[PDB]
Amino acid sequence: GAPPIMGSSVYITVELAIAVLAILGNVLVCWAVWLNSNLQNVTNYFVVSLAAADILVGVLAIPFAITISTGFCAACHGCLFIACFVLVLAQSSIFSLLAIAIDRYIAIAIPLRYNGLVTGTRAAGIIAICWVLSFAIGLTPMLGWNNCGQPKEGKAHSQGCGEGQVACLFEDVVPMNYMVYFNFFACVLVPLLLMLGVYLRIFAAARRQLADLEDNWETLNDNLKVIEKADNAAQVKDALTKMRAAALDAQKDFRHGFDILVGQIDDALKLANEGKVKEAQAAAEQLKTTRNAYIQKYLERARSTLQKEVHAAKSAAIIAGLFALCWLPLHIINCFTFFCPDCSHAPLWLMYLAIVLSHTNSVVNPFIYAYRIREFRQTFRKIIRS
Ligand SMILES: Cc1c(C#N)cccc1-c1cc(-c2cn(Cc3cccc(C(C)(C)O)n3)nn2)nc(N)n1
Ligand SMILES: CC(C)CCC[C@@H](C)[C@H]1CC[C@H]2[C@@H]3CC=C4C[C@@H](O)CC[C@]4(C)[C@H]3CC[C@]12C
Ligand SMILES: CC(C)CCC[C@@H](C)[C@H]1CC[C@H]2[C@@H]3CC=C4C[C@@H](O)CC[C@]4(C)[C@H]3CC[C@]12C
Ligand SMILES: CC(C)CCC[C@@H](C)[C@H]1CC[C@H]2[C@@H]3CC=C4C[C@@H](O)CC[C@]4(C)[C@H]3CC[C@]12C
Ligand SMILES: CC(C)CCC[C@@H](C)[C@H]1CC[C@H]2[C@@H]3CC=C4C[C@@H](O)CC[C@]4(C)[C@H]3CC[C@]12C
Ligand SMILES: CCCCCCCC/C=C\CCCCCCCC(=O)OC[C@H](O)CO
Ligand SMILES: CCCCCCCC/C=C\CCCCCCCC(=O)OC[C@H](O)CO
Ligand SMILES: CCCCCCCC/C=C/CCCCCCCC(=O)O
Ligand SMILES: CCCCCCCC/C=C\CCCCCCCC(=O)O
Ligand code: NA
C-alpha cells in the first residue's frame, strides 16, 4: 500500500494540466467569436455556450474533483454541491451539442426559412433556458435524491469528522440509481441517440439534394439529345415539356440564367406546337449556350455549398462523438458498480483514468475547430500572432 499522496500527486498534477489547457483553448474560442463577425452566427453561439461549460470545468469542476478525491470532512449537502456541479456542466454541454445538430439540420432541410426561423435572439433565449435546465438536472440530488439521510458514520468517525459531517466522496453522497437511470440513461444516452438520429437525417438530406442536382443536370442534357435526334414535332414537344418542368424545379445572374432558359424552352415549345421541327430543334440548340454560361455555374455553386454543409456537419458530429468517447467510460463503470454488486469495484487506477479522460473532453474542441474550420484557424492565428 504505497503512500496515497504519491498517486494523488500524479492525479492532481494531471488534473491541473488539463484545467490549464481547457481554460486557454476555450477562452481562445470565445475570443475568436467575439472578434470575428464571420464567426457570429447562431451555430457559434451554442459553440460559445459549450466553450463556457468547458472553461468552468477547468475553473471549478476540476478543483472540485481534486477536493472530493481527498474524502475531506464536509457537511453532506455542501459535499453534494461540489460533487454535482460537474453534472450541470456536462448537461449544458449535451444541450449545446443537441442544439448545434438541430441548427445544422434546419439549415440543410429548409434553408429558405432558416434565417427567419433561427435568430440570434431566439438562440440566446434557448441557451438561457438550457442552462437553467442543466442546473435543475445536475443539482437534482440536492433536491433530496441523495444519500445524506444515510451517512457512512464509521467512515466519518474514522476521519475525525464533526457532527453532521461526512467524508466527502462522490459515490457516498450521489446515489448510483440517479447516476445510471436518471443521469446516464435519460439525460445523456437519450440525447446522444437523438443527436445521432439528427446527424443521420442531415447526411441523408445532403445525399438526396446532391442526387437531385445531378438528376436534374442529366435530365437537361438527356432531353437535349432527344430533341436533336427527334423526327417529328411531337417528340420535340415531349422533351421540351419535361425540360420546362425540370427547369422550374431547379430554380426553386442566377435569376437571369433561368429566365433565359425557361424563355428559350418556351420559344422552342411554341415552334414545336406549330409543327416546325427543324426550327424548334435549332431554337433548342440555343439552350446549350445558356447551359454553359449560366446553368452549370449554378449547379457547381449549389454542389459546393452542399459539400461545405456536409463538411461542417461532420465537424460538429466529431465534437459530439468525442464527447461520447470521453464520457462513456465513467458511465459504463457506474453501470458495473450499480448492476453488478457481485463484481469488484473498478480499481483505483482505472477510476482516475476515467475521471481524467472525461475532463480531457474540455480540451479537445478548440483543436477540432482549428483543424476543421478555416475561419476559426485563421482567427486563432491572428489572435496568437498579435
Ligand atoms: C461526474 C460524472 C459524470 C458527470 N457529469 C458522468 C458520469 C460519471 C461521473 C462520475 C464522477 C466521479 C468522480 C469522482 N471524482 C473525484 C475523485 C477523483 C479521484 C479519485 C476519487 C476516488 C479515489 C475514487 O474517490 N474520486 N470526480 N468525479 N465518480 C463517479 N462514480 N461518476
Ligand atoms: C462564482 C464562484 C466564485 C463561486 C465559487 C463558490 C464555491 C467555491 C463554494 C460555494 C459553496 C461552497 C461549499 C458550501 C459548503 C461546504 C460544506 C463545508 O462543510 C465544507 C466546504 C463546502 C463543501 C463549500 C466548498 C466551497 C464552495 C463550493
Ligand atoms: C452567483 C451567486 C448567486 C452564487 C451562487 C450561490 C451558490 C453557489 C450557493 C448559495 C447557497 C449555497 C447553499 C446554501 C446552503 C447549503 C447547506 C449547507 O449545509 C451546505 C452548503 C449549501 C448546500 C450551499 C451550497 C452552495 C450554494 C447553492
Ligand atoms: C467508450 C469505449 C471506449 C468503451 C469503454 C470500455 C470500458 C469503459 C470498459 C471495458 C472493459 C470494462 C471493465 C471490464 C471488467 C471489469 C471488472 C469489474 O469487477 C469492474 C468493472 C470492470 C473493471 C470494467 C470497467 C469498464 C471497462 C474498462
Ligand atoms: C450505444 C451504447 C454506447 C449504449 C451504452 C452501453 C451500456 C449501457 C452497456 C454496455 C455494456 C453493458 C454492461 C455489460 C456487463 C454488465 C455485467 C452485468 O453483471 C450487469 C450489467 C452490465 C454492467 C452491463 C450494463 C450495461 C452496459 C454498460
Ligand atoms: C504542475 C502542477 C504542480 C503541482 C505540485 C504537486 C501536486 C500535489 C501535491 C500534494 C498532494 C496532496 C493531496 C491531498 C490529500 C490526498 C487524500 C488521498 O490520498 O485520498 C484518500 C481519500 O480517502 C480517497 O480514498
Ligand atoms: C469565477 C470563479 C473564479 C475562481 C473561484 C474559486 C475556484 C475553486 C477553488 C477550490 C475549490 C475547492 C473548495 C473546497 C475546500 C474544502 C476544504 C475544507 O473545508 O476543509 C475544512 C474541513 O474539512 C471542514 O470541516
Ligand atoms: C427536471 C425538471 C424539468 C423542469 C420542467 C419544467 C419546464 C419549464 C420550462 C419550460 C420551457 C419553456 C420556455 C418558455 C419561456 C418563454 C418563451 C417565450 O416567451 O416565447
Ligand atoms: C483561475 C481560478 C482557478 C482556481 C484555483 C484553484 C486551484 C486549487 C486546486 C485544488 C483545491 C484542492 C483543495 C484540497 C482539499 C483539502 C484537503 C483536505 O482537507 O484533506
Ligand atoms: Na463539455
Residue numbers in the entry: -1 to 208, 1001 to 1042, 1060 to 1106, 219 to 305
How do the authors describe this structure?
The Gs protein-coupled adenosine A2A receptor (A2AAR) represents an emerging drug target for cancer immunotherapy. Etrumadenant (3-[2-amino-6-[1-[[6-(2-hydroxypropan-2-yl)pyridin-2-yl]methyl]-4-yl]pyrimidin-4-yl]-2-methylbenzonitrile, also known as AB928) was developed as one of the first dual-acting adenosine A2A/A2B receptor antagonists. It constitutes a unique chemotype featuring a poly-substituted 2-amino-4-phenyl-6-triazolylpyrimidine core structure. Herein, we report two crystal structures of the A2AAR in complex with Etrumadenant, obtained with differently thermostabilized A2AAR constructs.
